[PDB]
Amino acid sequence: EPSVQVGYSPEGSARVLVLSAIDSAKTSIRMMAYSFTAPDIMKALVAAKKRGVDVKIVIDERGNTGRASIAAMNYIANSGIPLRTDSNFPIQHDKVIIVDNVTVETGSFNFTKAAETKNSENAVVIWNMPKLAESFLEHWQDRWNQGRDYRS
Amino acid sequence: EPSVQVGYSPEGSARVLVLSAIDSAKTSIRMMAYSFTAPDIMKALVAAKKRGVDVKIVIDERGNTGRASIAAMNYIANSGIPLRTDSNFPIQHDKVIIVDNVTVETGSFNFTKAAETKNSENAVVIWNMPKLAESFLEHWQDRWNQGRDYRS
């Protein structure tokens, strides 16, 4: 049952794989991000919410004050997706998407345009590994718990 | 046979896991790095070489001109470990260690002190998945092939 997929940037396969993970969510998505700006990623997350998926996101605070960051954060909050900024770490550097409590996307890939089209990056999606995902969930939960709500 | 381990920062488990992957190499190590500065990581890589392990590294060029970067690069080259800088990408952002052609370490974790002790990070080691590793190897090889030797 468990399997792993990989994609790379600027090749294009990383972006598509990350979108595939979000598009696959039937019940939940717990996301951690540093730079949070890619319009394509935001559109996919809100499409997940519309599907009924329970989406919650915690992102780095200091690295998300740029215009593009604000546009995405506003877009996300306006959709009813619970979102928090976290400044308890010099940098909340994780780029992680936990899907349906059993799948984990991770790697170097930041959720940005530069990450999708310019930089060399790798993104992996580890499917159906419940133990790995619950561990990542504890990591997500700890960061979320000390975050600040960003609402609309 | 395939299995996955995870570690986090600043907890301490990520650093130890990354060291565990390097310490486990019996035949080869193909590494990709953005910021390349952690003394502990360098000591471990050279200990691998001394063990007879075939170690080759390609790192981002623009992000490795700081003093700590130079100290590590010099330390690494002095040990006979083939090393290259790559500037063909705005940022060679991968933080990857491919061990013995079948294991892959990856995640948000940069090979730096801040990554080990201050930032929130995650590092995963995907053990014994030959197909995943050969794919990552092609990714490593492509970046290495357009790099510039850094020697001593």
Topology overview:
Two copies of one chain form a homodimer.
Chain A: E1 3-9, H1 13-24, E2 28-33, H2 39-50, E3 54-60, H3 67-78, E4 83-86, E5 96-99, E6 103-107, H4 113-117, E7 121-127, H5 130-145, E8 148-149
Parallel strand pairs in A: 2-3, 3-4
Antiparallel strand pairs in A: 1-7, 2-5, 4-8, 5-6, 6-7
What is the overall shape of chain A?
globular
What oligomerization state is this entry in? homodimer
CATH architecture of chain A: 2-Layer Sandwich
Strand adjacency order, main sheet of chain A = 1-7-6-5-2-3-4-8
Rg from alpha-carbon coordinates of chain A: 14 Å
CATH fold description of chain A:
Endonuclease, Chain A
Q: Count of DSSP helices of chain A?
A: 5
Give the largest interface: A-B, 35 and 35 residues
Q: What is the total number of structural domains of chain A?
A: 1
Number of strands of chain A: 8
H/E element order of chain A: EHEHEHEEEHEHE
CATH class of chain A: Alpha Beta
> Structural class of the helices, strands and pairings of chain A?
alpha+beta
Spatial separation of the terminal alpha carbons of chain A: 40 Å
Which percent range fits the helix content of chain A?
25-40%
Q: Which sheet architecture does the biggest sheet of chain A show?
A: 8 strands, mixed
Catalytic activity (chains A, B): a 1,2-diacyl-sn-glycero-3-phosphocholine + H2O = a 1,2-diacyl-sn-glycero-3-phosphate + choline + H(+)
Family (chains A, B): Belongs to the phospholipase D family.
EC number (chains A, B): 3.1.4.4
Domain PLD phosphodiesterase (chains A, B): 88-115
